[PDB]
Every structure is written in structure tokens, then in C-alpha cells.
Swiss-Prot record:
Keyword Metal-binding part of the UniProt annotation: no
Classification via CDD domains: PTH2
Cellular localisation: Cytoplasm
Domain of life: Archaea
Name listed for the protein in its UniProt record: Peptidyl-tRNA hydrolase
EC number: 3.1.1.29
GO molecular function per UniProt: peptidyl-tRNA hydrolase activity
A single GO cellular-component term on record: cytosol
Length: 123
């Protein structure tokens, strides 16, 4: 049916993104491997619906990930897994199993990200 695998990353952490991005990148793999172990081999075996997007807001993510988990979907907010005290401090990485690209589209916004950098304007 409509199966979709996507890891969303909440980038733009007013706090130093240097080391925090480093620990999360490592945790992103442990988090990814945690679900990707046998779950990806199940449906992701095709490897044609694997994509990564950004998160709109921590509150919206914690709320929809729970909604996705509600149907028995493997979802969880991935953060410094080595630690387990204050979730804040790091960015908000999340791993979502075979979601329905149909709902992830509106919820995670699969529309091309707009360039927040200086794009162009005849300048």
C-alpha cells in the first residue's frame, strides 16, 4: 500500500550545532540501525522510498510521530541516545518506518525546501 521511510531532522538549533550535530549524527545511525535492522529489510528492501526531510516544530513532530505510532508504525524521536536525561540541548532527529507518503507530505512538508540562503534577484 502506501509505505514510506523517512528520517526527519530538526536543524537550526539556536544552540551550537557543532558537537550537537556530531553526537546526533552518530545517534542518527544507532537510531536508524535500531529500526532499519529487520524493519527496513521488510519493506524498504526496495530502497526506492528512502528520503530525509527537516522538521517544522518539535511540538508538531512529537504530536504526529505519536499519531503514526498509533497505527502500530515504528516511530521515535532520535536524539543523543548515549544520554537519557534532558532531550533538549541537541537537535531533534526522528526515524519513521513505512509511513504513508500521503500523510508525511502534508505533515513533514515534502515540498522542495526554499533556499533560505541568498538565492538571486539580479543583484
Amino acid at each position: 500500500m502506501t509505505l514510506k521511510q523517512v528520517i526527519v531532522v530538526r536543524d537550526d538549533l539556536k544552540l551550537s550545532r557543532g558537537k550537537l550535530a556530531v553526537q546526533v549524527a552518530h545517534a542518527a545511525i544507532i537510531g536508524y540501525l535500531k529500526s532499519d535492522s529487520s524493519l527496513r529489510r521488510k519493506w524498504l528492501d526496495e530502497g526506492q522510498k528512502k528520503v530525509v526531510l527537516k522538521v517544522k516544530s518539535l511540538e508538531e513532530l512529537l504530536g504526529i510521530k505519536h499519531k503514526a505510532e498509533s497505527l502500530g508504525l515504528v516511530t521515535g524521536l532520535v536524539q543523543d541516545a548515549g544520554l537519557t536525561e534532558v532531550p533538549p540541548g541537541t537537535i531533534t532527529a526522528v526515524v519513521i518506518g513505512p509511513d504513508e507518503e500521503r500523510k508525511i507530505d502534508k505533515v513533514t512538508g515534502n515540498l522542495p525546501l526554499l533556499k533560505l540562503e541568498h538565492h538571486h534577484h539580479h543583484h
